[model samples]
Target: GSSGSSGEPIEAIAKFDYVGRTARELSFKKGASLLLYQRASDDWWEGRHNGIDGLIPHQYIVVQDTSGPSSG
Candidate 1:
């Protein structure tokens, strides 16, 4: 399936601490903020944090609005 991706990334907050299951995945702490790009068709999504880019689980994060209240 081809999605005409607008190339805009989404913002999200980590819901739980994660240790990457593989070398190419990302390890993050709960409450960490991220910028996500949905490049995969499964539950794995690409996210960037602290200038490092890696794959993170989609289920481990809570999607948030960029302009919403800071206390999410």
Candidate 2:
């Protein structure tokens, strides 16, 4: 994906809409997708969804393990 880190680290899909739980956070809706390139912490992840980058709770999104790079 067009993001940070080396290669697309991981991917996640927001099961439910998380609207900036914190003051500085992501505002996304259900089924909103994001990519995990860096680990902010054990509970939060840094990704981009809908053109915004912020910290998202690990509970909100269903992670998809690419294992490595994707093959088209």
Candidate 3:
């Protein structure tokens, strides 16, 4: 097993391509995958992609299954 956060974070999928207007925001293409840390607000989600961490609109993503029982 790899090292880092003891528990895995939530994973989500982008609904459409998004180009962030600032460095605080993250950019991702349609169907791009992201690991969500937490929700910054009702509309903003704090997450990471491409090794970059930033905020993204929650409306642009759909959360995926994170069931821990699965094996690689």
Model 3 residue 48 lDDT score:
94
Cα-based TM-score, every candidate = 0.71, 0.70, 0.76
Candidate 1 collision pairs: none
lDDT string for model 1 (31-65, tens) is 88777876554788887877878887878888665
The numbered model that scores best in lDDT is 3
Per-model root-mean-square deviation over C-alphas? 4.5, 4.9, 4.9
Better structure of 1 and 2 per TM-score: 1
What is the lDDT ranking, best to worst? 3, 1, 2
Worst 10 residues of 3 by lDDT: 63-72
Q: Model 1 — which ten-residue stretch has the worst lDDT?
A: 63-72
> Which regions of candidate 1 fall more than 4 Å away from where they truly are?
1-5, 65-72
lDDT of 1: 0.76
Better of 1 and 2 by lDDT: 1
For model 2, the superposed segments whose C-alpha errors exceed 4 Å read 1-7, 68-72
Name the weakest run of 10 consecutive residues (lDDT summed) in model 2: 1-10
Please provide, for model 3 over 1-72, each residue's C-alpha lDDT reduced to its tens digit, 9 standing for 90 to 100.
Answer: 666653467788887898777999999998897888877899888889999999988778886666442344
What do the candidate models score in CA lDDT, each in turn? 0.76, 0.74, 0.80
